[PDB]
């Protein structure tokens, strides 16, 4: 259900966080470099009745630089509505 | 803190952009829908105009639209709560 791996096998690459089973704004996904959030994370469309998606970011690996993925359930609450006043 | 406005003054049948400006929040703590006749517009864009210097945070959510005489538009800003974290390292 969550798996982390590199797109291609010390130069620029992509780091993938594969999520299978999870309903995506139903979810929040962070990619971490040494425990801290990577700024730009992309994600594929849902692909299917199982599904997966991939959250990925471009990265250059270094031997002591470590990477992870954090997945959280998202709950939406307390809407505030503002009408467009023409 | 939440404002809804068009890029240019609205002229009926003329292409424009609809903006929900949201200030005072980090983007990952809210979820923002733009609405047409009370229903969710599918393709919303967002910019983050923030620095982390403060007030603090300024976010724009927007979409090209053609206003019409009677089509009604709005913005909903939801609170986001995170739970059941899972963390997976890269081996």
Short mmCIF file of N, CA, C and O in Angstrom, two decimals, chain A residues 21-83:
data_model
loop_
_atom_site.label_atom_id
_atom_site.label_comp_id
_atom_site.label_asym_id
_atom_site.label_seq_id
_atom_site.Cartn_x
_atom_site.Cartn_y
_atom_site.Cartn_z
N UNK A 21 -4.56 1.22 -2.74
CA UNK A 21 -5.67 1.54 -1.75
C UNK A 21 -6.24 2.94 -1.25
O UNK A 21 -7.42 2.91 -0.76
N UNK A 22 -5.52 4.12 -1.35
CA UNK A 22 -5.91 5.52 -0.69
C UNK A 22 -6.53 6.81 -1.40
O UNK A 22 -6.02 7.44 -2.33
N UNK A 23 -7.67 7.25 -0.92
CA UNK A 23 -8.47 8.15 -1.80
C UNK A 23 -8.06 9.68 -1.84
O UNK A 23 -8.48 10.47 -0.98
N UNK A 24 -7.19 10.07 -2.84
CA UNK A 24 -6.11 11.17 -2.74
C UNK A 24 -6.29 12.60 -2.15
O UNK A 24 -5.29 13.25 -1.95
N UNK A 25 -7.49 13.11 -1.92
CA UNK A 25 -7.69 14.49 -1.22
C UNK A 25 -8.49 14.19 0.06
O UNK A 25 -8.99 15.01 0.85
N UNK A 26 -8.68 12.87 0.04
CA UNK A 26 -8.81 11.98 1.06
C UNK A 26 -7.41 11.91 1.70
O UNK A 26 -7.35 11.70 2.87
N UNK A 27 -6.31 12.21 0.98
CA UNK A 27 -4.94 12.11 1.55
C UNK A 27 -3.98 13.26 1.29
O UNK A 27 -4.03 13.89 0.22
N UNK A 28 -3.04 13.45 2.22
CA UNK A 28 -1.88 14.33 2.03
C UNK A 28 -0.51 13.60 2.00
O UNK A 28 -0.17 12.82 2.90
N UNK A 29 0.27 13.84 0.94
CA UNK A 29 1.52 13.13 0.80
C UNK A 29 2.73 14.06 0.80
O UNK A 29 2.80 14.95 -0.04
N UNK A 30 3.64 13.91 1.77
CA UNK A 30 4.94 14.61 1.81
C UNK A 30 6.12 13.69 1.42
O UNK A 30 6.21 12.55 1.85
N UNK A 31 7.01 14.20 0.60
CA UNK A 31 8.28 13.54 0.33
C UNK A 31 9.32 14.26 1.18
O UNK A 31 9.40 15.49 1.17
N UNK A 32 10.10 13.49 1.94
CA UNK A 32 11.04 14.09 2.85
C UNK A 32 12.48 13.86 2.45
O UNK A 32 12.82 12.77 2.04
N UNK A 33 13.31 14.91 2.54
CA UNK A 33 14.75 14.77 2.40
C UNK A 33 15.37 14.99 3.81
O UNK A 33 15.26 16.08 4.41
N UNK A 34 16.05 13.95 4.31
CA UNK A 34 16.52 13.94 5.70
C UNK A 34 15.46 14.36 6.72
O UNK A 34 15.74 15.11 7.63
N UNK A 35 14.26 13.80 6.59
CA UNK A 35 13.20 14.08 7.53
C UNK A 35 12.43 15.39 7.32
O UNK A 35 11.53 15.67 8.08
N UNK A 36 12.81 16.21 6.34
CA UNK A 36 12.16 17.53 6.17
C UNK A 36 11.48 17.67 4.78
O UNK A 36 11.93 17.05 3.82
N UNK A 37 10.38 18.40 4.67
CA UNK A 37 9.58 18.37 3.45
C UNK A 37 10.29 18.91 2.22
O UNK A 37 10.80 19.99 2.26
N UNK A 38 10.27 18.13 1.15
CA UNK A 38 10.64 18.57 -0.18
C UNK A 38 9.52 19.47 -0.73
O UNK A 38 8.36 19.13 -0.70
N UNK A 39 9.93 20.61 -1.25
CA UNK A 39 9.00 21.64 -1.68
C UNK A 39 8.05 21.23 -2.81
O UNK A 39 6.86 21.43 -2.68
N UNK A 40 8.56 20.63 -3.87
CA UNK A 40 7.71 20.31 -5.02
C UNK A 40 7.53 18.82 -5.18
O UNK A 40 8.47 18.09 -5.46
N UNK A 41 6.31 18.39 -4.99
CA UNK A 41 5.93 17.00 -5.18
C UNK A 41 4.88 16.95 -6.31
O UNK A 41 3.89 17.69 -6.31
N UNK A 42 5.12 16.12 -7.30
CA UNK A 42 4.06 15.93 -8.28
C UNK A 42 3.35 14.62 -7.98
O UNK A 42 3.81 13.83 -7.15
N UNK A 43 2.21 14.42 -8.62
CA UNK A 43 1.54 13.14 -8.60
C UNK A 43 0.78 12.82 -9.85
O UNK A 43 0.12 13.68 -10.44
N UNK A 44 0.87 11.56 -10.26
CA UNK A 44 0.03 11.05 -11.32
C UNK A 44 -1.48 11.11 -10.96
O UNK A 44 -1.91 11.19 -9.78
N UNK A 45 -2.28 11.10 -12.02
CA UNK A 45 -3.65 10.63 -11.96
C UNK A 45 -3.76 9.22 -11.33
O UNK A 45 -2.84 8.39 -11.44
N UNK A 46 -4.92 8.96 -10.71
CA UNK A 46 -5.33 7.61 -10.31
C UNK A 46 -5.43 6.66 -11.48
O UNK A 46 -6.00 6.97 -12.52
N UNK A 47 -4.88 5.47 -11.31
CA UNK A 47 -4.91 4.48 -12.34
C UNK A 47 -5.51 3.22 -11.74
O UNK A 47 -5.12 2.79 -10.64
N UNK A 48 -6.46 2.61 -12.45
CA UNK A 48 -7.25 1.53 -11.88
C UNK A 48 -6.91 0.14 -12.42
O UNK A 48 -6.79 0.05 -13.67
N UNK A 49 -10.87 -3.97 -9.20
CA UNK A 49 -10.94 -2.41 -9.29
C UNK A 49 -9.96 -1.65 -8.36
O UNK A 49 -10.32 -0.66 -7.77
N UNK A 50 -8.74 -2.17 -8.23
CA UNK A 50 -7.66 -1.60 -7.43
C UNK A 50 -7.19 -0.29 -8.00
O UNK A 50 -7.23 -0.13 -9.22
N UNK A 51 -6.63 0.57 -7.15
CA UNK A 51 -5.91 1.74 -7.71
C UNK A 51 -4.52 1.95 -7.10
O UNK A 51 -4.27 1.54 -5.97
N UNK A 52 -3.66 2.60 -7.86
CA UNK A 52 -2.47 3.24 -7.29
C UNK A 52 -2.35 4.64 -7.82
O UNK A 52 -2.92 4.97 -8.87
N UNK A 53 -1.54 5.42 -7.13
CA UNK A 53 -0.93 6.64 -7.68
C UNK A 53 0.56 6.77 -7.29
O UNK A 53 1.04 6.04 -6.43
N UNK A 54 1.25 7.71 -7.92
CA UNK A 54 2.68 7.96 -7.64
C UNK A 54 2.82 9.41 -7.32
O UNK A 54 2.29 10.25 -8.02
N UNK A 55 3.42 9.68 -6.20
CA UNK A 55 3.84 11.02 -5.89
C UNK A 55 5.33 11.01 -6.19
O UNK A 55 6.03 10.08 -5.81
N UNK A 56 5.82 12.00 -6.92
CA UNK A 56 7.26 11.96 -7.26
C UNK A 56 7.84 13.38 -7.19
O UNK A 56 7.11 14.35 -7.27
N UNK A 57 9.14 13.46 -6.98
CA UNK A 57 9.89 14.71 -7.06
C UNK A 57 11.22 14.42 -7.72
O UNK A 57 11.72 13.31 -7.60
N UNK A 58 11.77 15.39 -8.45
CA UNK A 58 13.13 15.27 -8.97
C UNK A 58 14.13 15.33 -7.83
O UNK A 58 14.00 16.18 -6.95
N UNK A 59 15.12 14.44 -7.82
CA UNK A 59 16.19 14.52 -6.83
C UNK A 59 17.55 13.95 -7.27
O UNK A 59 17.60 12.96 -8.00
N UNK A 60 18.65 14.57 -6.81
CA UNK A 60 20.01 13.99 -6.89
C UNK A 60 20.44 13.24 -5.59
O UNK A 60 20.52 13.85 -4.53
N UNK A 61 20.67 11.92 -5.66
CA UNK A 61 21.04 11.19 -4.42
C UNK A 61 22.50 11.35 -3.99
O UNK A 61 23.37 11.43 -4.84
N UNK A 62 22.73 11.44 -2.68
CA UNK A 62 24.07 11.42 -2.08
C UNK A 62 24.09 10.42 -0.93
O UNK A 62 23.12 10.26 -0.20
N UNK A 63 25.23 9.78 -0.76
CA UNK A 63 25.35 8.56 0.04
C UNK A 63 24.80 8.64 1.48
O UNK A 63 24.37 7.66 2.04
N UNK A 64 24.80 9.82 2.06
CA UNK A 64 24.28 9.96 3.41
C UNK A 64 22.92 10.66 3.43
O UNK A 64 22.32 10.78 4.51
N UNK A 65 22.47 11.15 2.26
CA UNK A 65 21.16 11.82 2.10
C UNK A 65 20.08 10.77 2.04
O UNK A 65 20.12 9.88 1.17
N UNK A 66 19.13 10.89 2.96
CA UNK A 66 18.05 9.91 3.13
C UNK A 66 16.66 10.47 2.85
O UNK A 66 16.37 11.64 3.10
N UNK A 67 15.80 9.59 2.34
CA UNK A 67 14.53 10.00 1.84
C UNK A 67 13.37 9.13 2.31
O UNK A 67 13.51 7.91 2.50
N UNK A 68 12.19 9.74 2.40
CA UNK A 68 10.99 9.07 2.91
C UNK A 68 9.74 9.73 2.36
O UNK A 68 9.79 10.76 1.64
N UNK A 69 8.62 9.12 2.72
CA UNK A 69 7.32 9.53 2.28
C UNK A 69 6.47 9.46 3.53
O UNK A 69 6.54 8.48 4.24
N UNK A 70 5.71 10.52 3.82
CA UNK A 70 4.70 10.55 4.82
C UNK A 70 3.28 10.72 4.20
O UNK A 70 3.00 11.65 3.47
N UNK A 71 2.43 9.76 4.48
CA UNK A 71 1.01 9.75 4.07
C UNK A 71 0.06 9.94 5.27
O UNK A 71 0.18 9.29 6.32
N UNK A 72 -0.84 10.89 5.13
CA UNK A 72 -1.84 11.20 6.14
C UNK A 72 -3.20 11.21 5.50
O UNK A 72 -3.32 11.69 4.40
N UNK A 73 -4.19 10.68 6.20
CA UNK A 73 -5.61 10.89 5.95
C UNK A 73 -6.01 12.36 6.13
O UNK A 73 -5.67 13.04 7.11
N UNK A 74 -6.72 12.87 5.14
CA UNK A 74 -7.24 14.25 5.19
C UNK A 74 -8.74 14.23 5.57
O UNK A 74 -9.49 13.47 4.95
N UNK A 75 -9.14 15.01 6.59
CA UNK A 75 -10.56 15.26 6.94
C UNK A 75 -10.89 16.75 6.79
O UNK A 75 -10.12 17.61 7.26
N UNK A 76 -11.99 17.05 6.06
CA UNK A 76 -12.40 18.41 5.75
C UNK A 76 -13.56 18.80 6.62
O UNK A 76 -14.48 18.01 6.84
N UNK A 77 -13.54 20.02 7.09
CA UNK A 77 -14.49 20.38 8.11
C UNK A 77 -14.76 21.87 7.95
O UNK A 77 -14.15 22.52 7.12
N UNK A 78 -15.75 22.37 8.69
CA UNK A 78 -15.95 23.83 8.87
C UNK A 78 -15.84 24.74 7.66
O UNK A 78 -15.02 25.69 7.66
N UNK A 79 -16.68 24.49 6.62
CA UNK A 79 -16.53 25.31 5.40
C UNK A 79 -16.79 26.79 5.68
O UNK A 79 -17.70 27.13 6.43
N UNK A 80 -15.98 27.66 5.07
CA UNK A 80 -16.32 29.06 5.02
C UNK A 80 -16.56 29.44 3.57
O UNK A 80 -15.69 29.19 2.69
N UNK A 81 -17.76 29.95 3.27
CA UNK A 81 -18.16 30.33 1.93
C UNK A 81 -18.15 31.82 1.68
O UNK A 81 -18.66 32.59 2.50
N UNK A 82 -17.61 32.24 0.53
CA UNK A 82 -17.67 33.63 0.20
C UNK A 82 -18.21 33.73 -1.18
O UNK A 82 -17.68 33.16 -2.02
N UNK A 83 -19.30 34.47 -1.38
CA UNK A 83 -19.92 34.67 -2.66
C UNK A 83 -19.19 35.74 -3.41
O UNK A 83 -18.74 36.65 -2.84
#
